[PDB]
Design an enzyme around this catalytic site. Structure first.
Site, short mmCIF file in Angstrom:
data_model
loop_
_atom_site.label_atom_id
_atom_site.label_comp_id
_atom_site.label_asym_id
_atom_site.label_seq_id
_atom_site.Cartn_x
_atom_site.Cartn_y
_atom_site.Cartn_z
N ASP A 46 0.84 -1.20 0.00
CA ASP A 46 0.00 0.00 0.00
C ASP A 46 0.89 1.27 0.00
O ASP A 46 1.77 1.45 0.94
CB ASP A 46 -0.89 0.06 1.24
CG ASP A 46 -1.85 1.27 1.19
OD1 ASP A 46 -2.85 1.23 0.36
OD2 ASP A 46 -1.56 2.29 1.92
N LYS A 80 -2.65 6.12 -4.43
CA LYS A 80 -3.81 6.97 -4.14
C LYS A 80 -3.57 8.37 -4.73
O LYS A 80 -2.42 8.88 -4.74
CB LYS A 80 -3.99 7.14 -2.61
CG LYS A 80 -3.97 5.80 -1.84
CD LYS A 80 -4.05 6.02 -0.26
CE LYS A 80 -3.73 4.74 0.48
NZ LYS A 80 -2.24 4.58 0.70
N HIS A 113 -7.84 9.37 -2.30
CA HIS A 113 -7.24 9.25 -0.99
C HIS A 113 -8.14 9.87 0.06
O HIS A 113 -8.23 9.38 1.22
CB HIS A 113 -5.90 9.97 -1.03
CG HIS A 113 -4.95 9.57 0.06
ND1 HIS A 113 -3.59 9.64 -0.07
CD2 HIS A 113 -5.21 9.07 1.34
CE1 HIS A 113 -3.03 9.24 1.11
NE2 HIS A 113 -4.01 8.89 1.95
N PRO A 214 -4.28 -0.45 11.55
CA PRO A 214 -4.87 -1.54 12.35
C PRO A 214 -4.15 -1.72 13.72
O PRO A 214 -4.75 -2.30 14.64
CB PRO A 214 -4.61 -2.81 11.44
CG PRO A 214 -3.26 -2.43 10.72
CD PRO A 214 -3.36 -0.94 10.49
N1 NAP Z 1 -5.89 5.96 3.36
C1 NAP Z 1 -5.45 6.70 4.41
O1 NAP Z 1 -5.93 7.81 4.64
C2 NAP Z 1 -4.46 6.08 5.36
C3 NAP Z 1 -4.28 6.62 6.64
C4 NAP Z 1 -3.41 5.98 7.49
C5 NAP Z 1 -2.70 4.80 7.04
N2 NAP Z 1 -2.85 4.34 5.77
C6 NAP Z 1 -2.13 3.16 5.26
O2 NAP Z 1 -2.21 2.21 6.29
C7 NAP Z 1 -0.91 1.76 6.70
C8 NAP Z 1 -0.95 1.23 8.17
O3 NAP Z 1 -1.37 2.28 9.10
P1 NAP Z 1 -0.33 3.24 9.91
O4 NAP Z 1 1.00 3.39 9.26
O5 NAP Z 1 -1.09 4.53 10.23
O6 NAP Z 1 -0.17 2.46 11.29
P2 NAP Z 1 -0.14 0.94 11.83
O7 NAP Z 1 0.21 0.01 10.73
O8 NAP Z 1 -1.35 0.83 12.69
O9 NAP Z 1 1.13 1.04 12.90
C9 NAP Z 1 2.46 1.19 12.39
C10 NAP Z 1 3.34 1.33 13.66
O10 NAP Z 1 3.39 0.08 14.42
C11 NAP Z 1 4.72 -0.45 14.49
N3 NAP Z 1 4.63 -1.91 14.33
C12 NAP Z 1 4.49 -2.56 13.16
N4 NAP Z 1 4.37 -3.86 13.39
C13 NAP Z 1 4.57 -4.07 14.74
C14 NAP Z 1 4.63 -5.24 15.63
N5 NAP Z 1 4.45 -6.46 15.09
N6 NAP Z 1 4.79 -5.03 16.97
C15 NAP Z 1 4.96 -3.78 17.44
N7 NAP Z 1 4.91 -2.63 16.71
C16 NAP Z 1 4.72 -2.76 15.35
C17 NAP Z 1 5.50 0.24 13.43
O11 NAP Z 1 6.86 0.44 13.96
P3 NAP Z 1 8.12 0.20 12.99
O12 NAP Z 1 7.77 0.73 11.62
O13 NAP Z 1 9.11 1.11 13.55
O14 NAP Z 1 8.40 -1.32 13.09
C18 NAP Z 1 4.80 1.57 13.32
O15 NAP Z 1 5.30 2.53 14.36
C19 NAP Z 1 -0.13 3.01 6.49
O16 NAP Z 1 1.29 2.88 6.55
C20 NAP Z 1 -0.65 3.42 5.10
O17 NAP Z 1 -0.03 2.57 4.10
C21 NAP Z 1 -3.75 4.92 4.94
#
Ligand code: NAP
Length: 318
Positions: A46, A80, A113, A214
């Protein structure tokens, strides 16, 4: 060697139910993160123009294709369109930049987006003197028209939406002369924001949901220590212990069991591998009901203050 289950889209394409998130994945770390994910068996990545790292994603993908670690047709690449680019020539220029950075000849899914169009120009986040977001001229329905052309031309396989309420999807599905239907709605979702009605609605329309943040997006800039923390929730960790799994893996599996695609972000090689090791256990019906009961209607990703522009998605109940 891992493989995420496929979720079938309305186009019959097969979208892997776990993908790698790249928002906040820094330059100089994202390239390796994508290599590691591909080696582990991730096929869904993504991406977005606004994350400003697509060129390093593109480098990783190209290098793994050259190495023969993976074929293009087995990858599933999502990007996006940012709302400062809704005007027709701009849809095509923003898309061409993403496709160039990513070094691809086609995208598997291209998403709107965010539903509100913003003023075009240099700033990605145009604001007035008082810091309120400035609206644009083209709507999301205008942008969609220009995105359908990309599908006609063979450059994108399917279109979708992100941060849409059911009202905005109704508007899209009811648009006169609609050519292509959205194949997914990518929105925040997790046990503190279970999206029950929006998921029910989307599925009833043959539209998948992709769960972003998530794990509770702990690295989001605006996090506050008193904000709920899913990865530290003791009831999530208890269910996790029962399956010999981490909280993160339970948080990922929750979506899989609702048939919701999920895209955890990591740039840590061990966690990348851990986050796709989620197909060797099953949460019981009791455990699912318990996790679902944690809904707090809480959004980690609620920073745009643009509730003064039309089509603000989060005023709707769903
Ligand atoms: N469409 C939209 O508006 C939108 C908005 C938000 C997000 N997104 C997409 O969704 C993806 C996921 O959401 P997000 O980046 O907001 O947050 P997320 O995936 O909920 O959390 C990412 C955070 O958790 C850590 N992490 C990852 N796996 C882990 C594990 N197994 N144990 C402990 N910590 C862990 C990562 O640290 P490290 O990286 O340092 O390991 C990072 O700090 C985004 O990257 C993006 O691609 C889309």
């Amino acid at each position: 060697s891992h493989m995420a289950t496929f979720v079938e889209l309305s186009t019959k394409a097969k979208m892997p139910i776990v993908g790698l998130g790249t928002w906040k994945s820094p330059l100089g770390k994202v390239k390796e993160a994508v290599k590691v994910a591909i080696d582990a068996g991730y096929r869904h990545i993504d991406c977005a123009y606004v994350y400003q790292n697509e060129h390093e994603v593109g480098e990783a993908i190209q290098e793994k294709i050259q190495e023969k670690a993976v074929k293009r047709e087995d990858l599933f690449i999502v990007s996006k369109l940012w709302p400062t680019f809704f005007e027709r020539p701009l849809v095509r220029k923003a898309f061409e930049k993403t496709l160039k950075d990513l070094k691809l000849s086609y995208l598997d899914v291209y998403l709107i987006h965010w539903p509100q169009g913003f003023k075009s120009g240099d700033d990605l986040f145009p604001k007035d003197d008082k810091g309120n977001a400035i609206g644009g001229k083209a709507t999301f329905l205008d942008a969609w028209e220009a995105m359908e052309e990309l599908v006609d031309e063979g450059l994108v396989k399917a279109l979708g939406v992100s941060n849409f309420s059911h009202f905005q999807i109704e508007k899209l599905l009811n648009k006169p002369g609609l050519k292509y239907k959205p194949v997914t709605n990518q929105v925040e979702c997790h046990p503190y924001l279970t999206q029950e009605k929006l998921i029910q609605y989307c599925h009833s329309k043959g539209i998948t949901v992709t769960a972003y943040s998530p794990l509770g997006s702990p690295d989001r800039p605006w996090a506050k220590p008193e904000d709920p923390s899913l990865l530290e929730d003791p009831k999530i960790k208890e269910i996790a212990a029962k399956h010999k799994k981490t909280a993160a893996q339970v948080l990922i599996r929750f979506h899989i069991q609702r048939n919701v695609i999920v895209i955890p972000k990591s740039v840590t090689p061990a966690r990348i591998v851990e986050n796709i090791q989620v197909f060797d256990f099953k949460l019981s019906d009791e455990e699912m009901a318990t996790i679902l009961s944690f809904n707090r209607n809480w959004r980690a990703c609620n920073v745009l203050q643009s509730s003064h522009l039309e089509d603000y998605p989060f005023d709707a109940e769903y």
